[PDB]
Each structure stands twice: as C-alpha cells, then as structure tokens.
Amino acid sequence: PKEPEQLRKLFIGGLSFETTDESLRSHFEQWGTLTDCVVMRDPNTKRSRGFGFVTYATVEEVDAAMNARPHKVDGRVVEPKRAHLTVKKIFVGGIKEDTEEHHLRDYFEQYGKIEVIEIMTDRGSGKKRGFAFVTFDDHDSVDKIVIQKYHTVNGHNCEVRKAL
Ligand SMILES: CN(C)S(=O)(=O)c1cn[nH]c1
Numbered sequence: 181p182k183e184p185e186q187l188r189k190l191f192i193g194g195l196s197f198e199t200t201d202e203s204l205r206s207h208f209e210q211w212g213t214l215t216d217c218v219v220m221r222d223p224n225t226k227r228s229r230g231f232g233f234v235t236y237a238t239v240e241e242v243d244a245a246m247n248a249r250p251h252k253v254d255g256r257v258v259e260p261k262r263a264h265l266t267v268k269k270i271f272v273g274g275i276k277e278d279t280e281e282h283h284l285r286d287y288f289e290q291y292g293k294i295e296v297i298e299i300m301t302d303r304g305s306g307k308k309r310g311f312a313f314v315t316f317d318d319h320d321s322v323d324k325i326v327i328q329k330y331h332t333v334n335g336h337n338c339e340v341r342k343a344l
Pocket of ligand 1: 292
C-alpha cells in the first residue's frame with residue numbers, strides 16, 4: 181500500500197536553467213527510486229522556468245533527500261520543499277497544564293533540530309494556558325509535522341499548525 185503520491189513529491193526551486201529531466205533525475209536518484217522527474221519549461225521557448233519536481237517511491241526516500249541538503253545540482257544550490265508557507269515554527273495546542281518543556285522536546289526533536297520551546301503562560305497569573313510554540317532550525321521539520329494526522333504528546337492528542 182503506497183503512500184499518497186502528493187506526500188512523495190519534492191518541488192525543487194532555484195534550478196540552473198541548464199538542468200534537464202535527465203540531470204535532475206541522475207542527481208536525486210542518489211536518495212531513492214524516482215517514479216517521476218520533470219523540469220518545468222516554457223511551452224513556446226522550451227527555456228527552463230527554473231524549477232521542477234521529483235517523485236520518490238516512498239516517504240522515507242523523501243526524508244533521505246531532505247536530510248542530504250544542501251543539494252548542488254548542475255553547479256547551483258537548489259531549494260527542495262515538500263508539496264508553500266515556509267516557516268520554522270509551530271503552534272502546539274491541547275497540552276493542558278501538565279505538559280512541560282521536556283515532553284515537547286523529547287517528541288519534536290525527532291522531527292528536526294529545536295532552537296526554542298515556548299510554553300505559554302497567563303500574563304496575569306502565570307498559569308499554563310495549554311499551548312506552546314516550537315521553533316526549529318529549518319522548515320522541513322514543520323512540513324513533516326503538519327502533514328501527520330495525529331500528534332500525541334504527554335498523553336494528549338494535540339493540535340499542531342504552522343505559526344506565523
Ligand atoms: C538534518 N535532519 C536529519 S533534521 O535536523 O531535519 C532532523 C532531526 N531529526 N529528524 C530530522
């Protein structure tokens with residue numbers, strides 16, 4: 181049973197205009213089986229639009245490609261992103277009053293490198309408000325997080341979304 185194709189795609193921006201379907205494929209096949217690989221071109225001139233997409237056979241292969249950034253393709257560092265609101269920070273809601281920093285760190289550190297955890301407290305009383313923000317060093321962490329159907333932290337079913 182195959183993961184949905186949309187979750188196996190990487191949009192690659194910043195291409196060299198000399199990158200082709202074939203040279204994009206030869207590069208990104210280092211991290212998995214590619215079922216599709218296309219450079220976007222002008223319909224009349226055939227000149228590259230400077231971006232394209234690759235489709236891997238599995239999500240773990242997408243992860244491997246993202247973990248191998250930075251990618252220099254045909255002499256140019258490109259910008260891969262999963263199938264964009266590119267942010268490094270998430271809102272985590274539903275954590276109630278008993279969730280602490282280490283609960284959030286232990287869970288979210290497996291999505292990416294954490295730089296800030298902010299457990300929100302009431303301005304007047306100091307009581308925990310039941311939500312938090314986590315800032316990572318890179319957007320792919322957030323992209324992986326928000327496509328999951330579920331997040332369970334400290335026994336709580338959490339609401340997680342991109343923040344600003
Ligand atoms: C470079 N990466 C492996 S990452 O920092 O995005 C990461 C850390 N844990 N999961 C992903």
